[PDB]
């Protein structure tokens, strides 16, 4: 127990499900993503180029020989762009508590409690300064709520995630204690 | 109020602003309407840190009383500047005594 | 996503100089804006007065994301005007699924569809709208003085470039010049206002200014007179940019001078973003205790602008004979209604403001769409009127006079009735949607004690209804001076269309006359959907008005 | 007091102008300079580097409007042949 | 216009802009903890310009980007 | 006085003396005894692109004298600022806006 | 009459190896500068408390003198800040004239 | 007074009023800038606890630390005074040789390594005090113990050897 | 509402970390405790909401 589980003032948002992280790391968002997120992301992605093709067949552009091929590559880039942003947003809303995250709470509790008992920092270690870690956190907190305008991702290992961390240390205490007596009573 | 100053930081009035934000957030809510009234003095201290109007007013008065008091008392021998440039030097102890009038 | 779309479209546009590729850059802009709608649609899963993002320089609110979606949809509807050719050729023999998807039609489409028209040849036109949209959705989300200034200029500078984009038009270059010059003086007032805020407060954050204003509102060496003075100058700049009287003289001239495709966008999007930003500022600058701070409220200028906008917009419009000057003045009297509900800061007025803004942005869009479609329909018509040969920039604004709509009822009855339904909505006639909007803004003001202003609004609504009715008298009360082109139906003048199956084999060949040319479906369906919304609103009102009741409940909540 | 005098000068440039549309470009810039100079002098008085940053961004936007404005003035001149108002 | 505008705006300014017969003098002294690694103003602007307030840089870069594309589109003859 | 001030005055004085020789000594004589054409758009573009790139390069100078603190987070943001301005340059290269080729 | 002194292959190889050698010497030097800076900072840190302590007694001295000078002149002390914090003076009372000199 | 750097300062205001008798008195340090930098590492080797208590104390009283932390400041000036006295009593010959070098070298330590190395060997042998720069890299020689200094204006002679405490 | 809730409470963490004089920054542990209470109350309220209604 570091004795300061909540160390930074954080914004509380009225949502419907428990908050896991105000700012998850990019690798965790991909890791906790459900296979439905993959279908949803790819479905949206293909929708961009497919809309341009369908719009070509029905109302023809009357362009010259290479124009449609250039346009399809641009529609294709915007498909992969929008499709990955939509896929990444679907997973992050469960960390934010803005989508049903019941499965993800279980995964998170396991990973962080298994980090605590391994002696690891809960969220990793940054090559950035404590102060730059603070600046980064204050930029990516609830950021995916703004992808329709500006894209931002978390690539910094900081410890400002909006959550009291006592629960992680409490379960690690109760899990080492559960295994200690079993190891010594048999 | 930004917290970053001209020399590498922080800003001079930033302590008063955080003292003001702390007061508002911790004493004023929707339950109690007049909690913010404990913030009135703290805001004046921050408006005063930025603009220094009340301090200027104290000094203009105190300076007018000081000048009207030292313009009428008898003067024995005012110390020359060269004497007050030798004050506290390792070889001019005579001039330090004259400056200190001890 | 808007920023990923701008840079990607920019890179593709940078390496091309083909003007035939404009059609497809506008189509990809529609698809790009649809992804922005799907991302902002997922950003509505929380109840919050606001969350500060990116270092507190931005914020997200349910109202901010709701109106980011609205801006993207309004932009998508306008973008269609450059994504599809104005007219199409349709035959009953090529009308099935097998035909539209598996078969193909061959014919000389160039003069029929206006393939090389001016609007279909600006490559960076879809790009510059995206730049304007970006500054609009930033204004809505700004939590800092600096971010406000940088966002307002991003929007303003792109609007100037839109007005000047038809470079061969001596009317568009003048209008953009007028707009940039009077718009720059407006920007100084916005910059003076924010500068005077920071020098008296030491802060650039809106929330710190809100808390400084909050503590000052209690019924000594530092009395906060600066906030209501600074916001007053700050309001003059934004009053100009929405063309509220008396700072209104530019709009009739600029909206008349630039092409009609352009004025659809220019005359709609700017008011959507400016009015949203003002609402939150009016709410947190309110006085809950009547003191000497409340006697100098900056919101009085909005109450005087509303009074002046109601009078000027309806009285000056009486003697207008140019349709775009008339619609410019009609917008001024509509912002007098919008400004009256903003100035009364009440739960009811805020709900009335959200409805008036959305419903009017949608309805004033139909008026522009109908005008553009009417001009593209006179392709098969000829006129000998002398007053029409003297017109200028007849391709940029095909319809410039209300005299040109004389007898349109005979030429196109439902297009005429669609414009009738839209115009009567501007008047406020029930059961039309525009009535329910003015109803909510009259009931809000009356319940709060703005009875004198409400009486002035219903008097000018009669005066403004005079010039609305004059447009209707032209379309339905007189015979048309426009007559069908004699050559397009000579009985010897036919164009051969070929029907081809998948592997380019001639299924059929058809002989077609000018009677087989019609309006493109993108413009006919868009007009049809909005006219129906104006007409059938009293059967579909629950979720539109419920959204506004919930948005205002969060803003006033606690 | 210098910042307010120059703000008047830019404003009086619009008061005294019936023919120069160039001088309205100049008077907008004098007004931007006065407002940036005010922010800059109040920044030194409050030990705040954020005022210097806001001044920098006002200089960038000010140049960008100069580019956008003189470009539109060039588009207008190409077709009109005069930048003079027939008063 | 000169009388009215000046008579209003002057009151709005802060005390330190209008700070300049007994007269006030501005006193200054030295500090040591706040002088350890003093930065020039550009280094201080740089310390915060690309991190804490980076959104302003992003919006200004797009304003310059607009002034580039828009000015060329309105003036040059394509190709 | 400061060296900068005395330096500017001395440069100013030398300029006066060189000027004086011309007025004092060089010979003097009392006798000191309308078309329109379009100008190239290129002249506008040279100042336009200079003004925009000069501002952008200026905005990068603070980064160079604050790199130890900006570090990796600052590098990233400065690279995103470089990339946006580069895309605008590729546009003037793409449209030959400079009209040089 | 081709000569190897201007053949591209030897020139690029020679130019490349020069750049790598200089980039090796830049890597080592800046690493030494950054360790010289570490020793300069620690040297000023060990001196900061003695230097600040002598400054703090001087700030206590003048403040207690100014508080007394007022009580003897204006009859009381005018409170400037509602808080009890020590704020370093912005303005000071000054003699009417400087030392003769 | 204000910590702002002055731009148009032409006059100095002195105050001959002494501290009140109630405050316990202290004798201020009389070493100049260059002697203080020669002994800066020796002072931080011995006074570090007191130097840290003083900074920690002022931190524990925000806005009120000039007052309320006087006794601790008096402890830092007595402890630093004890190190300056000790160098004078034992290391005077090497101590002056070092800081008079820094006088003509922009007060830059890398410029005067040979004098410091001889002073480091005198202090360590007489006062057991050693110069430690905290958090120095472990893959390389300490910069202060390097035979070659790249940024030195004058080359360090090969026979001048860096003092390692114990060899 | 006559009360404003900061959209960005993380402003309490603002401030240059360089050339900081001792005793410059105020003690804000009571601010930290106010924002800790608020996080704990929403966590518990939601926990009551989706555990007493899911059984
Ligand atoms: C407006 C439009 C905006 C559009 C863009 C949106 C941007 C969204 C936010 C991204 C930028 C902020 C994050 C980076 C800043 C930072 O400090 O990173 C922390 C990171 C280390 O953080 P840490 O907490 O110590 O360790 C946790 C890491 O996850 C542990 O990391 P690791 O040790 O496993 O190392 C992996 C990786 C870690 O760094 C990253 O993953 C950051 C870069 C991700 C870019 C993703 C694509 C762009 C979105 O670093 C590398 O070795 C690769 C760096 C270069 C990758 C190739 C170039 C990418 C851009 C191409 C264009 O810093 C670095 O590694 C330094 C390199 C950063 C390079 C960023 C370059 C961006 C250029 C963009 C041009 C346009
Ligand atoms: C409050 C809101 C309440 C809403 C409730 C529902 C309102 C009523 C339903 C509206 C459905 C409109 C779309 C269906 C349509 O146009 O069918 C007629 C149209 C054929 O009938 P037509 O008007 O005799 O065709 C004349 C020629 O095709 C020659 O036609 P064209 O070359 O002039 O242009 C053909 C086509 C060009 O656009 C397309 O190809 C449509 C592409 C849509 C997917 C991307 O035009 C349109 O489809 C315009 C639709 C405008 C929709 C937005 C209005 C706002 O159907 C098609 O062939 C379009 C593609 C098939 C539908 C696929 C997508 C379905 C879902 C669309 C969601 C958006
Ligand atoms: C007279 C007005 C004419 C206006 C023309 C447009 C008519 C529609 C008027 C606006 C209605 C509100 C539109 C909001 C965006 C559409 C949302 C929607 O209908 O379904 C949500 C869905 C969102 O679904 P989703 O994929 O994000 O997640 C689904 C979640 N569950 C499983 C619970 C359903 O549609 C979208 O994908 C949003 C993208 C819309 C693309 C552009 C639409 C523009 C219209
Ligand atoms: C100068 C005089 C010395 C060089 C030339 C000496 C000479 O005579 O040529 C030797 C040889 C060419 O051989 P050959 O032509 O056969 O003549 C043999 C004569 N005994 O020359 C060679 O093959 C070697 C020539 C030099 C190779 C090394 C080049 C080093 C380049 C360093 C960076 C230069 C960067 C310049 C950038 C310019 C940008 C425009
Ligand atoms: C055209 C040419 C353009 C060249 C641009 C720059 C290319 C890369 C820079 C050249 C390599 C620089 C270098 O030599 O680094 C040497 C460094 C050794 O570390 P050093 O500072 O010497 O300290 C040792 C103390 N015993 O060694 C290292 O830092 C480790 C290097 C590991 C990665 C090497 C590259 C892969
Ligand atoms: C006249 C109209 C003017 C305004 C126009 C704009 C109106 C926009 C209305 C959008 C309302 C929000 O619509 C919302 O979309 C999101 C999209 O993920 C979905 O909402 C849902 O998303 C996620 C899944 O991704 C769920 O886990 C979450 O519990 C829920 O919020 C629902 O489909 C709907 O609740
Ligand atoms: C006539 C045009 C067609 C009708 C136009 C209006 C249709 C869309 C109205 C949507 C707004 C109201 O509908 C509702 O509002 C709230 C406001 O935060 C949002 O609701 C969102 O946050 C809440 C609270 O965490 C979640 O429980 C909910 O799942 C989520 O979607 C959504 O936006 C929408 O679920
Ligand atoms: C010859 C025609 C002369 C009249 C023509 C115009 C009048 C048309 C109908 C006006 C109805 C009277 O005006 C209506 O009266 C009721 C009470 O009586 C007011 O109810 C009240 O609301 C506020 C809020 O509590 C009260 O502070 C105030 O005492 C009063 O204005 C309504 O706000 C007002 O709208
Ligand atoms: C820049 C610093 C301030 C200036 C310092 C130097 C000032 C010098 C002023 C005196 C210059 C005298 O220079 C002298 O002027 C006279 C009068 O024009 C000239 O005289 C010339 O013009 C006159 C006009 O009436 C003729 O009659 C005369 O025949 C002819 O030579 C001389 O050829 C010239 O040598
Ligand atoms: C970090 C640095 C990155 C550098 C990136 C370099 C930019 C790469 C993309 C831009 C270059 C490709 O874009 C290309 O530009 C050239 C040069 O004007 C154009 O060249 C062509 O058109 C122009 C204008 O009519 C003619 O003057 C020219 O003679 C002709 O070859 C191409 O039509 C365009 O497609």
UniProtKB/TrEMBL annotation, chain B:
Function field: Accessory subunit of the mitochondrial membrane respiratory chain NADH dehydrogenase (Complex I), that is believed not to be involved in catalysis. Complex I functions in the transfer of electrons from NADH to the respiratory chain. The immediate electron acceptor for the enzyme is believed to be ubiquinone.
Species of provenance: Chaetomium thermophilum (strain DSM 1495 / CBS 144.50 / IMI 039719)
Lineage per the UniProt record: Eukaryota, Fungi, Dikarya, Ascomycota, Pezizomycotina
Record text on subunit structure and interactions: Mammalian complex I is composed of 45 different subunits. This is a component of the iron-sulfur (IP) fragment of the enzyme.
Family stated for the protein in its record: Belongs to the complex I NDUFS5 subunit family.
Name under which the protein is recorded: NADH dehydrogenase [ubiquinone] iron-sulfur protein 5
UniProt-annotated location(s): Mitochondrion inner membrane; Mitochondrion intermembrane space
Cystine pairs: 13-49, 23-39
Domain of life: Eukaryota
UniProtKB/TrEMBL annotation, chain C:
Catalytic activity as recorded in UniProt: a ubiquinone + NADH + 5 H(+)(in) = a ubiquinol + NAD(+) + 4 H(+)(out)
Keywords: Membrane, Mitochondrion, Transmembrane, Transmembrane helix
Transmembrane segments: 28-47, 67-85, 122-140, 178-199, 225-242, 254-278, 298-319, 326-347, 353-382, 414-437, 449-469, 517-539
Membrane topology annotation: Multi-pass membrane protein
GO annotations of cellular component type: membrane
Swiss-Prot/TrEMBL GO biological process terms: ATP synthesis coupled electron transport
Keyword Nucleotide-binding found: no
InterPro entries assigned: NADH-Q_OxRdtase_suN/2, ND/Mrp_TM
Compartments, record wording: Membrane
Domain NADH:quinone oxidoreductase/Mrp antiporter transmembrane as annotated: residue spans: 143-464
UniProt-listed Pfam families: Proton_antipo_M
Main EC class the enzyme belongs to: translocase
Documented EC number(s): 7.1.1.2
Molecular function terms, GO-annotated: NADH dehydrogenase (ubiquinone) activity
Similarity field: Belongs to the complex I subunit 2 family.
PANTHER family assigned: NADH DEHYDROGENASE
Protein name: NADH-ubiquinone oxidoreductase chain 2
UniProtKB/TrEMBL annotation, chain E:
GO terms, molecular function: NADH dehydrogenase (ubiquinone) activity
Subcellular localization, as worded in the UniProt entry: Mitochondrion membrane
GO cellular component: mitochondrial membrane
Membrane-spanning segments: 1-18, 53-76
Domain of life the protein comes from: Eukaryota
Keywords: Electron transport, Membrane, Mitochondrion, NAD, Respiratory chain, Translocase, Transmembrane, Transmembrane helix, Transport, Ubiquinone
Family: Belongs to the complex I subunit 6 family.
Function statement: Core subunit of the mitochondrial membrane respiratory chain NADH dehydrogenase (Complex I) which catalyzes electron transfer from NADH through the respiratory chain, using ubiquinone as an electron acceptor. Essential for the catalytic activity and assembly of complex I.
Protein name (database record): NADH-ubiquinone oxidoreductase chain 6
Native species: Chaetomium thermophilum (strain DSM 1495 / CBS 144.50 / IMI 039719) (Thermochaetoides thermophila)
Lineage, broadest ranks: Eukaryota, Fungi, Dikarya, Ascomycota, Pezizomycotina
Span covered, complete protein: 113 to 222 of 224
UniProtKB/TrEMBL annotation, chain G:
Major localization class: mitochondrion
Keyword Transmembrane helix set for record: yes
Topological category with respect to the lipid bilayer: Single-pass membrane protein
Swiss-Prot/TrEMBL keywords: Electron transport, Membrane, Mitochondrion, Mitochondrion inner membrane, Respiratory chain, Transmembrane, Transmembrane helix, Transport
Segments traversing the membrane: none
Subcellular location field: Mitochondrion inner membrane
Gene Ontology CC annotation, any one: respiratory chain complex I
Domain of life: Eukaryota
Record family assignment: Belongs to the complex I NDUFA13 subunit family.
Function comment: Complex I functions in the transfer of electrons from NADH to the respiratory chain. Accessory subunit of the mitochondrial membrane respiratory chain NADH dehydrogenase (Complex I), that is believed not to be involved in catalysis.
The protein's name in its UniProt record: NADH dehydrogenase [ubiquinone] 1 alpha subcomplex subunit 13
Organism this protein belongs to: Chaetomium thermophilum (strain DSM 1495 / CBS 144.50 / IMI 039719)
């Amino acid at each position: 127990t570091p004795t300061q589980t909540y160390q930074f003032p954080s914004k509380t948002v009225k949502t419907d499900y428990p908050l896991i992280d105000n700012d998850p790391h990019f690798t965790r968002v991909i890791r906790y993503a459900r296979p439905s997120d993959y279908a949803h992301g790819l479905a949206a992605a293909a929708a961009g180029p497919a809309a341009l093709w369908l719009m070509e067949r029905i109302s023809p552009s009357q362009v010259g020989r290479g124009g449609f091929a250039k346009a399809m590559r641009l529609a294709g880039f915007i498909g992969l762009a929008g499709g990955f942003l939509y896929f990444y947003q679907r997973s992050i809303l469960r960390f934010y508590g803005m989508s049903e995250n019941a499965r993800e709470v279980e995964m998170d509790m396991r990973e962080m409690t298994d980090r605590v008992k391994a002696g690891l920092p809960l969220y990793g270690e940054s090559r950035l300064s404590p102060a730059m870690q603070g600046v980064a956190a204050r930029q990516s907190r609830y950021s995916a709520l703004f992808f329709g305008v500006m894209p931002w991702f978390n690539f910094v290992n900081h410890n400002q995630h909006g959550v009291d961390t006592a629960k992680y240390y409490q379960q690690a205490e109760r899990e080492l204690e559960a295994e200690r007596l079993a190891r010594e009573q048999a | 109020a930004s917290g970053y100053g001209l020399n590498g930081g922080p800003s001079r009035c930033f302590p008063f602003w955080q003292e003001l934000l702390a007061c508002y957030v911790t004493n004023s809510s929707e339950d109690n309407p007049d909690g913010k009234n404990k913030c009135i003095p703290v805001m004046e201290d921050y408006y005063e840190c930025l603009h220094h109007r009340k301090e200027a007013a104290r000094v203009r008065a105190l300076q007018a009383a000081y000048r009207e008091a030292e313009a009428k008392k008898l003067q024995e021998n005012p110390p020359t500047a060269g004497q007050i440039r030798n004050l506290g030097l390792l070889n001019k102890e005579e001039d330090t005594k004259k400056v200190h009038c001890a | 996503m808007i920023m990923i779309s701008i840079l990607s479209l920019l890179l593709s546009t940078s390496v091309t100089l083909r003007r035939d590729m404009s059609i497809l850059f506008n189509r990809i802009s529609i698809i790009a804006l649809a992804y922005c709608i799907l991302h902002d649609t997922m950003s509505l899963s929380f109840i919050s007065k606001g969350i500060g993002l990116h270092g507190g320089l931005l914020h997200i609110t349910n109202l901010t994301q709701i109106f980011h979606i609205f801006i993207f949809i309004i932009s998508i509807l306008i973008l269609q005007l450059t994504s599809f050719y104005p007219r199409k050729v349709w035959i009953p023999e090529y009308s099935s699924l097998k035909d539209i998807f598996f078969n193909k039609i061959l014919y000389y489409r160039t003069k029929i569809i206006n393939k090389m028209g001016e609007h279909m040849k600006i490559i960076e036109y879809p790009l510059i709208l995206l730049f304007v949209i970006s500054g609009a959705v930033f204004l809505i989300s700004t939590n800092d003085l600096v971010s406000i200034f940088l966002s307002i200029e991003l929007q303003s500078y792109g609007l100037y470039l839109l007005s000047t984009i038809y470079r061969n038009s001596e009317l568009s270059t003048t209008g953009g010049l007028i707009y940039f010059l009077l718009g720059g003086l407006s920007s100084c007032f916005i910059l003076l206002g924010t500068s005077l805020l920071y020098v008296n407060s030491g802060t650039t954050s809106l929330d710190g200014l809100y808390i400084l204003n909050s503590i000052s509102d209690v019924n000594s060496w530092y009395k906060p007179y600066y906030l209501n003075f600074s916001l007053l100058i700050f309001s003059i700049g934004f009053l100009f940019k929405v063309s509220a009287a008396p700072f209104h003289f530019w709009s009739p001239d600029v909206y008349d001078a630039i092409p009609t495709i352009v004025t659809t966008f220019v005359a709609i999007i700017a008011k959507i973003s400016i009015f949203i930003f003002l609402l939150e500022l009016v709410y947190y600058t309110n006085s809950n205790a009547n003191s000497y701070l409340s006697e100098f409220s900056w919101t009085y200028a909005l109450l005087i602008s509303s009074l002046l906008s109601l009078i000027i917009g309806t009285v000056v419009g009486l003697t207008q004979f140019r349709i775009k000057r008339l619609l410019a003045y009609s917008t001024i009297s509509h912002v007098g209604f919008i400004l009256l509900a903003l100035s009364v800061s009440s739960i009811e007025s805020t709900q009335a403001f959200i409805f008036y803004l959305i419903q009017y942005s949608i309805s004033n869009l139909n008026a522009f769409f109908i005008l553009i479609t009417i001009g593209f329909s006179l392709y098969g018509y000829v006129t000998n009127n002398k007053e029409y040969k003297s017109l200028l920039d007849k391709n940029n604004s095909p319809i410039q006079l209300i005299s040109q709509l004389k007898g349109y009822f005979y030429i196109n009855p439902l297009l005429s009735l669609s414009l009738a339904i839209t115009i009567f909505s501007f008047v406020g006639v029930p059961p039309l949607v525009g009535f329910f909007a003015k109803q909510m803004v009259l009931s809000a003001a009356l319940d709060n004690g703005y009875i004198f202003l409400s009486l002035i609004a219903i008097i000018t609504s009669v005066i403004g209804a005079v010039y609305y009715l004059n447009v209707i008298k032209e379309i339905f009360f007189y015979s048309p001076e426009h007559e069908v082109n004699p050559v397009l139906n000579e009985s010897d003048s036919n164009f051969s269309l070929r029907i081809l199956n998948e592997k380019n084999v001639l299924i059929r060949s058809v002989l077609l006359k000018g009677r087989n040319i019609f309006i493109s479906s993108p413009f006919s369906i868009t007009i049809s959907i909005i006219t129906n919304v104006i007409l059938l609103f009293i059967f579909m009102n629950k979720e539109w008005l419920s959204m506004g009741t919930i948005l205002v409940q969060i803003l006033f909540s606690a | 007091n210098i910042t307010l005098i120059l703000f008047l000068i830019g404003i009086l440039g619009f008061v005294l102008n019936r023919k120069n549309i160039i001088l309205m470009l100049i008077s907008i810039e004098i007004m931007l300079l006065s407002i940036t100079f005010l922010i800059l002098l109040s920044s030194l008085n409050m030990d705040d580097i954020i005022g210097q940053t806001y001044a920098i961004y006002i200089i960038v936007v000010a140049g960008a409007e100069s580019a956008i404005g003189l470009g539109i003035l060039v588009a207008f001149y190409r077709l009109r042949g005069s930048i003079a108002i027939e008063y | 216009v000169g009388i009215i505008i000046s008579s209003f705006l002057f009151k709005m300014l802060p005390y330190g802009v209008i700070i300049s017969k007994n007269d006030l003098f501005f006193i200054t002294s030295k500090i040591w903890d706040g002088a350890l690694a003093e930065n020039n103003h550009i280094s201080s602007i740089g310390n915060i310009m690309y991190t804490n307030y980076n959104v302003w840089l992003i919006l200004a870069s797009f304003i310059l980007l607009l002034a580039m594309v828009g000015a060329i589109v309105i003036t040059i003859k394509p190709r | 006085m400061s060296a900068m001030s005395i330096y500017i005055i001395f440069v100013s004085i030398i300029a006066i003396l060189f000027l004086a020789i011309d007025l004092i000594f060089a010979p003097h004589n009392p006798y000191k005894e309308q078309s329109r054409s379009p100008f190239n758009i290129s002249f506008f573009i040279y100042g336009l692109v200079f003004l925009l790139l000069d501002l952008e390069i200026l905005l990068l100078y603070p980064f160079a004298v604050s790199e130890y603190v900006n570090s990796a987070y600052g590098l990233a943001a400065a690279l995103i600022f470089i990339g946006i301005i580069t895309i605008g340059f590729v546009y003037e290269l793409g449209h030959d806006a400079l009209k040089v080729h | 009459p081709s000569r190897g002194l201007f053949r591209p292959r030897p020139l690029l190889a020679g130019a490349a190896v020069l750049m790598l050698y200089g980039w090796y010497k830049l890597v080592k030097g800046i690493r030494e500068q950054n360790e010289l800076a570490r020793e300069k900072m620690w040297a000023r840190i060990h001196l900061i408390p003695l230097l600040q302590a002598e400054e703090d007694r001087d700030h206590v001295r003048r403040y207690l003198a100014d508080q007394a000078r007022e009580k003897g002149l204006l009859g009381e002390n005018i409170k400037v800040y509602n808080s009890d914090r020590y704020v370093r003076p912005t303005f000071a009372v000054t003699p009417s004239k400087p030392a003769q000199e | 007074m204000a910590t702002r750097k002055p731009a148009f300062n032409q006059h100095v205001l002195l105050d001959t009023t002494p501290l009140p008798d109630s405050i316990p008195k202290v004798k201020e340090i009389g070493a100049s800038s260059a002697p203080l930098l020669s002994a800066s590492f020796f002072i931080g080797a011995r006074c570090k606890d007191y130097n840290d208590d003083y900074m920690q104390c002022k931190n524990e009283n925000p806005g009120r630390g000039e007052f309320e932390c006087l006794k601790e400041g008096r402890r830092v000036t007595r402890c630093a005074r004890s190190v300056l006295k000790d160098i004078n009593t034992h290391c005077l010959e090497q101590f002056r040789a070092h800081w008079q070098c820094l006088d003509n070298n922009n007060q830059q330590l890398w410029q005067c390594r040979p004098a410091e190395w001889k002073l480091n060997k005198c202090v360590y042998e007489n006062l057991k005090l050693e110069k430690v720069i905290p958090d120095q890299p472990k893959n390389s020689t300490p910069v202060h113990l390097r035979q070659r200094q790249i940024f030195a204006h004058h080359a360090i002679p090969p026979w001048e050897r860096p003092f390692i405490p114990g060899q | 509402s006559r009360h404003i809730e900061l959209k960005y409470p993380e402003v309490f963490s603002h401030g240059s970390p360089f050339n900081v004089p001792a005793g410059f920054y105020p003690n804000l542990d009571h601010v930290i405790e106010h924002y800790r209470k608020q996080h704990l109350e929403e966590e518990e309220r939601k926990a009551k909401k989706l555990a007493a209604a899911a059984a």
